[PDB]
Nucleic acid binder design. Structure first.
Ligand SMILES: [Mg+2]
Ligand SMILES: [Mg+2]
Ligand SMILES: [Mg+2]
Length: 112
RNA sequence: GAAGCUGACCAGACAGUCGCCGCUUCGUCGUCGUCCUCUUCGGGGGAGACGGGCGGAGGGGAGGAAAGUCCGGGCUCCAUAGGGCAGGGUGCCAGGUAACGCCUGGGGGGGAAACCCACGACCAGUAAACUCCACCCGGAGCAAGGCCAAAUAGGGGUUCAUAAGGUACGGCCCGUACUGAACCCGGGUAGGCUGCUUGAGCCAGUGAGCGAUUGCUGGCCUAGAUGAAUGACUGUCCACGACAGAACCCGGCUUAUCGGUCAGUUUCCCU
């Protein structure tokens, strides 16, 4: 089962503060990814995009949707970690294929 | 036939593998210390409500601007001697609306798309050049509050309540009872459910009004999420796809929009 239930998202900011105080760098000159270990056995991810970086509410939402579709497909492969995503400045200019390959280009060096 | 305007619709459809939400129902497991009857009452059976009570089934899920600080209202909480000053808005006539800086029909001028413009007394006093002449004008907001869970005083003062609080006017003073308040000796809901999508709606028939709009009769009810809900490759009538995001709701205008199909309208004149 490749479902994406409620127990796979960082709801409260406490998990965000935990990931911030225990971070490991894994970013590009465009997108930065952080994370930390947990204990539930299944990995969880957080979604944080800055409104000041890019406006246009169809954007940011598109980034969230693409990130969810890229994360929920590899939940049975990558180890159990508490991830978090952030979007920098010039990110809304890329299309879907470029963003997808850029997101899949980072998770290869996550051998933790 | 080419070019320019206004109005109407659209700015994708179909299938293509897994998934996110909420609506209804189906049985299923606990709680009822809910109800009723039998009972071994260690309780069982049935009816309701709640809980992740586990899956199945059915049918669903972003606009012509959802976007703005540009207006008006719906619905709550707080507050409010009646007397003015001060400030703001509106200012051709007549209608629409629940209201309006919104809509419509006339007149004057402006004039040609200035067929759109302040068009309230330039003499009542030297006016998209000033005073004034009338009407109106509390504040904050679905994190408003409402219901619960839960909360766990701090013996109260120089003692007066007058200038602790301009009490509310509140920008100002006339004062209406002008108002219960200093630091120790302070510790306290962080959660849940409703508001919440039936809309001062939509469609059809039929009168009224030059117009905006409306009288009457029938039918329709699958965004409401809470780091906050839209991805997959093949063909296509692929108009080769652009501006863009719901967050309590409604009525207008204000920006942004590649463009495609019709209707009306003018110039070009092979026609
Ligand atoms: Mg919006
Ligand atoms: Mg409050
Ligand atoms: Mg809306």
């Amino acid at each position: 089962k490749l479902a994406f239930p409620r127990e796979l998202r960082l709801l409260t900011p406490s998990q965000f503060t935990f990931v911030f105080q225990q971070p490991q760098r894994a970013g590009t000159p465009q997108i930065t990814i952080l994370g930390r270990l947990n204990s539930l056995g299944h990995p969880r991810i957080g979604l944080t995009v800055a409104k000041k970086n890019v406006r246009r509410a169809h954007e940011r939402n598109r980034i969230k949707r693409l990130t969810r579709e890229s994360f929920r497909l590899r939940q049975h492969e990558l180890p159990a970690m508490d991830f978090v995503v952030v979007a920098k400045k010039g990110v809304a200019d890329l299309d879907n294929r470029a963003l997808s390959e850029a997101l899949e280009k980072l998770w290869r060096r996550h051998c933790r």
